[PDB]
Design a protein around this ligand. Structure first.
Ligand SMILES: Nc1ncnc2c1ncn2[C@@H]1O[C@H](COP(=O)(O)OP(=O)(O)CP(=O)(O)O)[C@@H](O)[C@H]1O
Ligand SMILES: [Mg+2]
Ligand SMILES: [Mg+2]
Length: 260
């Protein structure tokens, strides 16, 4: 991976990485601001299957303009000794994922958890109103700013109409907005208790539990939780889509009521 992309974005420290890409802190040399730059692996860049999915991620996230969703500024293909190197320029979020927060600090106070998920609901609901289902809602894809703002990211498998998968999504079924609602329920359960609703020694077991087993009410796993919060989480985690919040807006309206 090179020094600068397109003679414009000076690459700095790695912020995150996975199996198909990496994210750098970078400096926009024209605009004089720091940005987050996602770069496709390069050996994968020669693969149309991966090259297209990466471009689709950029296009999906660029279709959304919301203060709680990571904004896309630019996209390109840098010239390297390897060949073309696809990249996406995004707003830099100075913060941490919920995955990091729960791992270092443990469960959040109910009040903070309610605010954080209410804000995530609002982002997802916006996505849905714009015909996009995220499908990868999980703590590693939600960050909290240095200003306490929530930012939903990673539209890598979003579609334009184990521990966090909805039962429909497990079966690669028709997944809709109520699948994101379920995944939000899982994320909420985890920031309230420190653990997701189901764990197991394998992915199929975790999947079997999502499909067949009722979650343990959150108050039974962790002290200081109301029966009303149990009810909200347990309704988001309902097995049948007809029994969950029908939209993320509805989930938020109920969380706000627990708060107020
Ligand atoms: N705009 C941004 N600002 C700050 N950090 C960011 C960021 N975008 C991503 N990150 C950091 O990098 C991590 C990975 O981001 P992201 O979820 O977009 O990658 P990814 O899941 O697509 C990797 P892969 O698909 O290769 O496994 C995030 O959890 C976050 O820590
Ligand atoms: Mg991710
Ligand atoms: Mg990805």
């Amino acid at each position: 991976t090179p020094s600068h992309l397109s003679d414009r974005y000076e690459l700095g420290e790695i912020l995150g990485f996975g199996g198909m890409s990496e994210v750098h802190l970078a400096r926009d040399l024209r605009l004089h601001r720091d940005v987050a730059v996602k770069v496709l692996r390069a050996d994968l860049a020669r693969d149309p299957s991966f090259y297209l999915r990466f471009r689709r991620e950029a296009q999906n996230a660029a279709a959304l303009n919301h203060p709680a969703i990571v904004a896309v500024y630019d996209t390109g293909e840098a010239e390297t000794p390897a060949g073309p190197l696809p990249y996406i320029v995004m707003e830099y979020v100075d913060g941490v994922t919920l995955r990091d927060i729960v791992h270092t600090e443990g469960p959040m106070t109910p009040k903070r958890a309610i605010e954080v998920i209410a804000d995530a609901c609002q982002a997802l609901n916006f996505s849905h109103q714009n015909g996009i289902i995220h499908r990868d809602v999980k703590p590693a894809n939600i960050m909290i700013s240095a200003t306490n703002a929530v930012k939903v990211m990673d539209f890598g498998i979003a579609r334009a109409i184990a521990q966090y998968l909805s039962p429909e999504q497990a079966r690669g079924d028709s997944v809709d907005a109520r699948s994101d609602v379920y995944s939000l329920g899982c994320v909420l359960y985890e920031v309230l208790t420190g653990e997701p609703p189901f764990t197991g020694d394998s992915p199929v077991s975790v999947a079997y539990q999502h499909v067949r087993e009722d979650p343990i009410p959150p108050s039974a796993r962790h002290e200081g939780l109301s029966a009303d919060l149990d009810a909200v989480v347990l309704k988001a985690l309902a097995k049948n889509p007809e029994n969950r919040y029908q939209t993320a807006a509805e989930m938020r309206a109920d969380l706000v009521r627990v708060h107020n």
